[PDB]
Amino acid sequence: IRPRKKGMRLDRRRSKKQYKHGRHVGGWNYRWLGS
Amino acid sequence: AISHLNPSISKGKVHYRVPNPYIPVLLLQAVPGLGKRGELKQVRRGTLRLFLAPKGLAVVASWQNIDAFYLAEKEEEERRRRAQ
Amino acid sequence: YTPPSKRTWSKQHNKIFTPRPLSERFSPHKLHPEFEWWRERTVQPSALFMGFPDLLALPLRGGSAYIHEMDAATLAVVLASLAHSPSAYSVSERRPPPSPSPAVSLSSSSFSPTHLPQHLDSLLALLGRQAAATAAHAPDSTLAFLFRGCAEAGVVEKNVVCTLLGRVEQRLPCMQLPECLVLLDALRPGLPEVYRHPRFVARLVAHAGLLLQFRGAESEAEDLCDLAFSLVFAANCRDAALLQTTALLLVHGKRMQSLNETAPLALARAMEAFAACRDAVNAPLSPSGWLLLSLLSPVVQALHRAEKGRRGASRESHALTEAAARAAAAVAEETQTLKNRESSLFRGLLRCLERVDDHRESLSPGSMCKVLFAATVARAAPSRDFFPDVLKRLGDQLGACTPEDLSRALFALVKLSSVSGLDPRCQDLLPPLLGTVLQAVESSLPVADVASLARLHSAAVSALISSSETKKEEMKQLAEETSRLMHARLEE
Amino acid sequence: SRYQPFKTASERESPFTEAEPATNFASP
Amino acid sequence: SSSYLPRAATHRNRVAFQLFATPREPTASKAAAAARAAAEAVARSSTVSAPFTVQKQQRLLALLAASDLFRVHGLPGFSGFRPSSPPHLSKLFRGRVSRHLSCRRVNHLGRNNSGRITVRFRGAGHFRRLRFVDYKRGRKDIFGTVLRLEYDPNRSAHLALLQYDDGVLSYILATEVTRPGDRVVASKHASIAPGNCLPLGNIPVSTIVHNVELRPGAGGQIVRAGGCYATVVAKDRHFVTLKLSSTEVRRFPADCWATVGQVSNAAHAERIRGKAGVSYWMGERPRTRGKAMNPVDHPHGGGTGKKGLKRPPVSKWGILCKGYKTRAKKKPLGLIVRRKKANKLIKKF
Amino acid sequence: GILRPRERLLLNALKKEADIRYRGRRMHKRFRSWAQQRVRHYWLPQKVCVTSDPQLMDGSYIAACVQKAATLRKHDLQLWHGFSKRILELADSLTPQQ
Amino acid sequence: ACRPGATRMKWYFQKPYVRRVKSDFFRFPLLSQVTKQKIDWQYHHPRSGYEAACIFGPNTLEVTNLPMGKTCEYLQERLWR
Amino acid sequence: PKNLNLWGKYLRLVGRGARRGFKKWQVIPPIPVKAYGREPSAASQTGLYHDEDFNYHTKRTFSMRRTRRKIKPNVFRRTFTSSLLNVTIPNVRVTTSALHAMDDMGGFDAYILRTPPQELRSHMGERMRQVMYYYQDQPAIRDWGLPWKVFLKVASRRDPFYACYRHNLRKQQYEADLRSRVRSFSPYYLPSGHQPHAERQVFHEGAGESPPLNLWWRENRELEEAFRRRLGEAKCFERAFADSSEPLGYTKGRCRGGGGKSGRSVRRRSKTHKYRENRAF
Amino acid sequence: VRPNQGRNDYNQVGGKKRGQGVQVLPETIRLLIETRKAATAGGPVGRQPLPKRRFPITEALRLPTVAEVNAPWEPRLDKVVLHSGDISRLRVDAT
Amino acid sequence: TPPKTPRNVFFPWQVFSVHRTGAFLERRRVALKVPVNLTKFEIQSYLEKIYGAR
Amino acid sequence: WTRASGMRNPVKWTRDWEVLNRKVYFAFDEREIRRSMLDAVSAHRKTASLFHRMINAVPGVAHAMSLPGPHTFF
Amino acid sequence: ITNVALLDPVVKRPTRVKRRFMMNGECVRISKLSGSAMPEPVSTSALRQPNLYQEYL
RNA sequence: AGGAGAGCGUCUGUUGUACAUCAACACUAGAUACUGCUAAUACCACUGUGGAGGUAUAGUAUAUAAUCCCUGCCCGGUGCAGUAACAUGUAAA
RNA sequence: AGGUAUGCAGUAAAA
RNA sequence: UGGUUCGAAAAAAAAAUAAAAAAAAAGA
RNA sequence: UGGGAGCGAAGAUAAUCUAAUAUGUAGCUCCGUUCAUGGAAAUCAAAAGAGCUUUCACUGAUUGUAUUUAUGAAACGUGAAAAAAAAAAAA
RNA sequence: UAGAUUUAUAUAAACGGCAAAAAAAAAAAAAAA
RNA sequence: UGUAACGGUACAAGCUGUAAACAAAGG
């Protein structure tokens, strides 16, 4: 990705999409620590 | 208010018709060609918005304004009688 | 497509919204990774003023102040906030009750909430040191504000004051009259004497004189009024030449148009200063009387405008009442030499007294003493409740008076004691007030000034002539003591 | 619409400028 | 372009002032008195009031035409290259434009904010500087001296370095008869001489003008190119009619300012390049013909061997480009009295 | 962009001469260190104004003012003779540090 | 489905407040007779109950016990009527 | 059925399968957003659009070809004067429905203060209401007359003095920067007072001798600096632009012919095409 | 050449970067100071019949001692006071 | 990676070890393995205070 | 990409001594100067105060000395 | 439990509590924000309330 | 890759890297058409950007091309211009 | 024709 | 001798890096 | 998330092709799932009656829409599951 | 729960306008998520 | 929360944090 597009894109962790999937080593239905 | 029936769609925009461009108003001062004080006149919304309300010659005919005018007139009459 | 219902048709934008957690659906019995429970949060300061933590919240809540990081402008603002009757209610609350806070009220209180003023001494010392540090980087106006704010808040550290004096003396020639007025404000009575370095005061007065001499055109009427007030009181000046120049610029400087629009309180203070320094004005009606009339007329005009018009308005009403009281007191001393219903002096005095009568509560103790003095000098009375209702409050506020106020009050009481026609409440109130005022005057004699001593001697002589049947011995003692004290001070 | 004025001149025969002032009270 | 001063400084529809004043007096009253005195002095000095016509321009040009030590000693220059004329004889300055009155030109190369090509056939060309030319002539009632004439790579006309009587330097458009040592002024009391700037209401009919303001105080916008000029046809109290270089007759407010004379460098059109390289230096790129492309690339493309247009001429975007009018029909004519017709009709009638 | 050949040659020669000038300029800088030390642990944490009236100065203030003036090279004869007069007045009240 | 507009309103039953340990002010603070809510001396200011007088003048009434499930504007209109 | 004030009367009681299988292209005309139950748009939440907002409609022809198109609301940019906010509010984006609602309520202030959230349908309006109530609580801040968006955020409300100080500081920084740029681009240049004579060509024969320069601006350095700043204030020209605040303003569409680039089927921008080019929205 | 040429922030006017040495107008400081000064004006409610001096004075015989300060809560350290404040404002017999 | 050195140490953890080089070193020189984050001043003070080396 | 500069200049200059000699010619004999003779005189006004004053105070002298003709001023 | 947080006895904000042990072995819970010891938990006798939902079940 | 000639392109250039180095493309120039400036045209978030911080000796579009002599007839058709619509005009449309 | 050795602000001129 | 650093000029950000650790009472 | 909201295709069926089907599907953005969705009739029905909302089976691939291909957990109703309305004028 | 526990994972959101750099003077300034 | 970089440890797909596998016997 080149500078002009980088200057307008946002980082992955600026949203909540990271916490809306259950992907993990054991599969796709991660049970978080502490349930 | 606008009506949402048969709007005009052009240029990607939507324009809504205004079947009733009139609103009732209470006259707070003598307006030459419109009426005397204390009258309820149907005027055009633009006329109310840009001339009457800005110049303080009339106000929308809400129950609050109507009742306030009525009570103020009654108080003024009582004040006249008290002065007499 | 699901057709809406009574409870569901209204919706908010996914990102621009008013947060309402009470109605937003939530499942508290589940783990929510989005909130990052593992991650610790930072406890921010709960109250901020001018972008920094509020010092008025530190005694109760603690926390760092970051005073060393403050620049000159923020420091001057903070000094003003601490000096001008600070209230802990100005601090911000956290998740407050829905009902309005006491900060809305403009009325002062007789008790200090949430801590004593002295609970900020360490922060005051830190602020003084930071002011001494930042004095070198401030512009002229900000430097003058820093100086005045330190003087008013009570920074006393002598090295700090020496540094401030050095910087101010360095940058004095580059300052205009408004900054000179700001600096003079730091020399008001009651402020620390460390700031009253005689050489610095002389330099400030000389610079103000040069500013008047070469820039009289640019001077505003309110600025001239403040300058006269400060010269007579703040700087304790005998500069008859400078005071006369100020008076001429006020009257004959094509300033009549500006005299109407200037605030009445400034005119009242100016005429008070001129009444104090009459002898200078009446030097190579009297000219002082003409000056008093010229300054009085706009005050009467403002009073008339207010009466014809009859939270925001309360401040201007209080200011107008204070202006009326001060103007009446100033006019009384000149009227002492006139003794007549002068075409305008007596009438403006009566109008000011009427304003006082309708706004007795707003009076400060100094205002009460001034108005009593004015009424007794005029031998008039705005109403029949005036004297009793003012004497009651004078007795209730006796402790906050100064020697000048006490001299005025004693003069008024001596004058009133000789009046045969009095109300029963006035008769009951008089003797206790007379005794307490005499005790206070005797206690505060060594701190009285020459004008106060002269007024006290005049009151004693008047009582001996006319009030020889009430505390006669104490009045002879007061007369002799005042004579000796005046002799000593004249020799000084 | 190459030319797109902000204000378009009003038409004489449009119903908007000819609609009736209506009545304050329907019953009378 | 918009790569220079920001919109907040460049855009203003209604200009509230027409006189850029720089008073010297301590007070406003004395400034007004001095301005009146300067206007009266300009009026006293002004003597010429007759119109400045094509024939008078020709007479002045004829009069101007009628009316070994200076080198770097011991300096053998290039083997072949030499300037066309020495500095003390060249018509133009031969030096460098003032640095304080110019800046580097931002070369957009025919591409807009999207990065795509919107203006076709543009090339890098030679490096250029944008120079700040006073289209307003804001300073009034102060005389200035033309010190030198200068080349401008962005403009078809010549520039003139004007030094006002107080030492201020500026660049203005030079007239066909502008020469070093000329005295110029902008005022309503000014004489009708080339280079002077006056309101259109104070310029007699038949006079030739340039650098005409569409809005008073907003700077001249009409008639700028080298050799161009407009003629004053008629005058009324509020409006003055002008015939423009395009043969368009248009009215202008009488308060719009203008400069007397023809735009300098009337011989620009006579230049012959001789090779593709000159246009390459000037900043052009090759123009491929529409009918030389494939049918997907132009309406005229396609067909075994060479062919004709096969239809009335159209552009890349399918619009007739020979006789088809493009001005918006609903857009009002406004102050335009009459707009020109096709050149064939003009020359045949 | 492009330049006219004369301009190309002149500016290229200027660039070459600038490079050679830099090389010649740096020749004798054997004892030029980009990393440099400055001593500041003798500077007092209190602030002072050097032109303040001497009559308001004590030992602690006048000593700091003298040291600051020496550091700042504010060698003014009037200032330092005022320093001398005030220090001789305050001789009785100076600590060894001052 | 989406964020709730003013048509969707919820409220919950209020548990009566009992100071289970009378001396434990940290966990069972005193109620204020003015605000009828727990005293928070750290982050709240004392209220006399007359503050709205300085805002709305002497001719003012305080109304209490207004219900849930209604917009403040709707209740304002109803109370005005 | 119930909820006759909302759209979907004949869907309310037909079944679950029909409700889930409803085909939007069946609806030719736009439905009002409030009756449809549509989420407000960001533009509507930043303006006062009342019943109007982005909508959709379907095109159906005798050949039975269907096509759905997004349609934008009819919005104007208008200025208001607010007594409750003690400031003029330039360039608020408003609609006909909003204007009629203001007329009904009794003006801008009444409309902001009294309208319920569902009808107002404007988070910006809610924030204005909050600022009006805050000004009622603290009249002294109202006397400043700052733009209402200064106190849009709650933190600015908690720290008013810093809000005003920062506002003024940023304003002064902006002013100084713009002044410097204008001075740099000014058309008038004043050379140094020790060398005012610029290089000149040989004066044409017969030209009258130029008078000696009058350097009145060398009497005082303060006068010199003031004159230099005044000269720096000058501008080369002033440009005209489309502005709806002007009676005769206008904008531009496309070329008269109406054609397009040959062989190119240009795709209109969307949220999945050229979504974030040069700016967020 | 300039990837960010078209952005809304490109070559923006103002900013803290370029406004390092710019101060607010002195009128702004005056306005803030006067607004603070006029925030607590009013009449003298409450009675002060006796003078018990612009700066407050603390009495030394009312401050809690170390023993009292350290004492646990109830439903030579008794003669020593640790006070944070201004000794020049303390009222004591000797200093 | 290694913990940053505090202003006052009181308990240094850094290990200075002798390094046997396959290259040549002069008479008065010695090579030591040291943590990567230490400066020349830190190394010199460490050696002069813990060992008294000049 | 590189940030080397100074003695590590990444510019590949020519090493041809004849070309470098031509460069010397272009850099010294054919160098272009913007300033004027009066600019130089003003720069040295502190050492040539009297002649600077005469040039600025005597009418016509500045015009004569500001003309394009290559001149030598002692 | 993740939706809830312990409160500092002095600042009354979410805090973290660590167990420290004295020489004798006495345990003290200390709060991060102020360093204060945690007050002893309220006794079961004071906390007790009947569980009416279980009786209903 | 010399001397004497013809064809095609005037020429120097571009050119399909890896089957086409050509008579293909461009080119100096002569024309025609549009465009009065918030110009036309282009980009197609459209109170925005390039055009252009330029102003009819300018910008854009489509042919034909550098030098010499020439460049005939047709407005019936199509398009365009013109007018309320006609009449009428316009082919280097 | 980038910046050279007490260092931060800051105006003008220029081989 | 370069980088770093100021400028060009850049969140146009080289993950595990810094003149870059809660920011002056610093105890000379 | 074949649950809910917004925008919203083509390959495939129609033996080409259009509608319709695919499908309101895929991708994209947003909710975050019984502590939820929704909801205590200005409802549905017949001239008898039912009684918020929700789930299952039947009625029934019926009556419908599409009119070459297909789609259709329709409405009323019947048998079951679960069952709830509303502590609450202050204290 | 005896202590200790480096660095990166761009976080004032235990929080509230949107909008680059987790939140940027007003305006220019534009939105189906 | 999860993961990783370096460092220590049998120079490691384990363990572990410069206290880098262990304090349990303190006024």
The 3-state secondary structure of chain E reads: CCCCCCHHHHECCCCCCCCCCCCCCCCHHHHHHHHHHHHHHHHHHCCCCCCCCHHHHHHHHHHHHHCCCCCCCCCCCCCCCCCCCCCCCCCCCCCCCCHHHEEECCCCCCECCCCCECCCCECCCECCEEECECCCCCCCCCCEEEEEEECCCCCCCCEEEEEECCCCEEEEECECCCCCCCEECECCCCCCCCCCEEEHHHCCCCCEEECEECCCCCCEEECCCCCCCEEEEEECCCEEEEECCCCCEEEEECCCEEEECCECCCCHHHCCCCCHHHHHHHCECCCCCHHHCCCCCCCCCCCCCCCCCCCCCECCCCCECCCCCCCCCCCCCCCEEECCCCHHHHHHC
CA H228 from centroid of its chain's CA atoms: 36
Q: Is E301 left (phi over 0), alpha (psi -120 to 50) or beta?
A: beta
| Interface contact flag, F6 E281, Cβ < 8 Å | no
| Interface contact flag, C34 A16, Cβ < 8 Å | yes
Q: CA–CA separation, C18 vs C24, rounded Å?
A: 11
For residue C406, count other CB atoms closer than 10 A to its CB: 24
Q: How many residues does chain J have?
A: 54
Backbone angles phi, psi at B28, to 5 degrees: -90, -20
Amino acid at E132: F
Q: Which two tokens stand for residue C373?
A: 């003095």
The conformation of residue A13, written as its DSSP 8-state character, comes to: G
| Interface contact flag, B18 H96, Cβ < 8 Å | yes
Q: Which of H23, H21, H43 is nearest to H33 (CA)?
A: H43
- Distances from the Cα of E339 to the Cαs of E222, E243, E281, E336, H252, in angstroms? 15, 10, 36, 7, 21
Residue H12's nearest nucleotide, by CA–C1', is: P43
I chain contacts of residue C174, beta-carbon cutoff 8 Å: none
Chain position carrying tokens 């040039």 = K55
- CB of H135 closer than 8 Å to CB of H142: yes
Rg, chain K, Cα only: 20
Q: CA–CA separation, C467 vs E299, rounded Å?
A: 121
Q: CA–CA separation, K3 vs J46, rounded Å?
A: 36
Q: Which of E49, E21, E44, E39 is nearest to E193 (CA)?
A: E49
Q: CA–CA separation, B4 vs H57, rounded Å?
A: 13
- Distances from the Cα of H92 to the Cαs of B47, C58, H245, in angstroms? 21, 42, 12
Rg, chain L, Cα only: 16
The contacts of residue C209 (CB under 8 Å, 6+ apart) are C239, C241, C242, C245
The conformation of residue C166, written as its DSSP 8-state character, comes to: H
Q: Which two tokens stand for residue E161?
A: 């370095």
For residue B39, count other CB atoms closer than 10 A to its CB: 14
HEC letters along chain B = CCCCCCCEEECCEEECCCCCCEEEEEECCCECCCECCCCEEEEEHHHHHHHHHHHCCEEECCHHHHHHHHHHHHHHHHHHHHHC
The nearest alpha carbon in chain D to B40 belongs to D24
Q: Which two tokens stand for residue K65?
A: 């000395």
Q: Do chains H and E touch (3 or more CB pairs under 8 A)?
A: yes
Q: Give me the resolution in angstroms, 1 decimal.
A: 2.2
Residue J33's nearest nucleotide, by CA–C1', is: R7
Q: Apex CA L45: angle with CA L42 and CA L46, to 5°? A: 55
For residue K31, count other CB atoms closer than 10 A to its CB: 11
Rg, chain G, Cα only: 17
Q: CA–CA separation, F88 vs H94, rounded Å?
A: 80
Strand O contact with C341 (CB < 7 A): no
Nearest to G6 among C10, C107, C311 (CB): C10
| Interface contact flag, F1 E125, Cβ < 8 Å | yes
Residue K42's nearest nucleotide, by CA–C1', is: N13
Determine which helix (DSSP H) or strand (DSSP E) holds H76, and give its type and residue range: strand H76-82
Q: Which nucleotides of R are covered by protein (CB under 7 A)?
A: 1-2, 5-7, 17-19, 26-27
Q: Which two tokens stand for residue H130?
A: 């909050």
Q: Which residues pair with C59 in a beta bridge?
A: none
Q: Which two tokens stand for residue H127?
A: 């924030």
- CB of E230 closer than 8 Å to CB of E223: yes
Q: How many residues does chain L have?
A: 57
Q: How many residues does chain G have?
A: 81
| Interface contact flag, H71 B62, Cβ < 8 Å | no
- Distances from the Cα of C120 to the Cαs of C57, C203, E98, in angstroms? 10, 33, 62
Chain position carrying tokens 């009574």 = C6
Determine which helix (DSSP H) or strand (DSSP E) holds J18, and give its type and residue range: strand J17-18
CA E229 from centroid of its chain's CA atoms: 10
The nearest alpha carbon in chain I to C182 belongs to I30
Between the CA of E202 and the C1' of M74, what is the distance in angstroms?
55
Q: CA–CA separation, E334 vs E272, rounded Å?
A: 40
Q: Give the neighbours of chain F: at least 3 Cβ pairs within 8 Å.
A: C, E, K
Q: CA–CA separation, G4 vs H174, rounded Å?
A: 40
Handedness of CA E308, E314, E320, E326 (dihedral sign): negative
- CB of C275 closer than 8 Å to CB of C247: no
Q: CA–CA separation, C6 vs I22, rounded Å?
A: 56
Q: Give the neighbours of chain G: at least 3 Cβ pairs within 8 Å.
A: C, H, L
Q: Which two tokens stand for residue H111?
A: 């409309």
Q: Which of C373, C435, C363 is nearest to C404 (CA)?
A: C373
Angle (deg, nearest 10), helices F59-72 and C158-171 = 50
| Interface contact flag, K26 F9, Cβ < 8 Å | yes
Between the CA of E278 and the C1' of M13, what is the distance in angstroms?
13
Nearest to B60 among H52, H73, H103 (CB): H103
Q: CA–CA separation, E222 vs E200, rounded Å?
A: 13
Q: Coil, strand, or helix at residue H68?
A: strand
**C126-142: burial string, b at 16+ Cβ within 10 Å, e else:** bbbbbbbbbbeebbbbb
- CB of H35 closer than 8 Å to CB of H7: yes
The nearest alpha carbon in chain F to K7 belongs to F23
CA J34 from centroid of its chain's CA atoms: 5
The conformation of residue H213, written as its DSSP 8-state character, comes to: P
Q: CA–CA separation, C253 vs A24, rounded Å?
A: 87
Q: How many residues does chain F have?
A: 98
Q: Which of H186, H190, H232, H233 is nearest to H215 (CA)?
A: H190
In G1-81, the DSSP E strands lie at none
Q: Apex CA F3: angle with CA F2 and CA F7, to 5°? A: 165
The contacts of residue G38 (CB under 8 Å, 6+ apart) are G17, G29, G30, G31, G32
- Distances from the Cα of C42 to the Cαs of C39, C361, L11, L14, in angstroms? 10, 49, 13, 10
Burial-class residue E284 by CB neighbours within 10 Å (0-12, 13-18, 19+): middle
Chain position carrying tokens 């035409």 = E65
Backbone angles phi, psi at G39, to 5 degrees: -70, 135
Q: Which of I95, I89, I92, I94 is nearest to I55 (CA)?
A: I89
| Interface contact flag, I31 H144, Cβ < 8 Å | yes
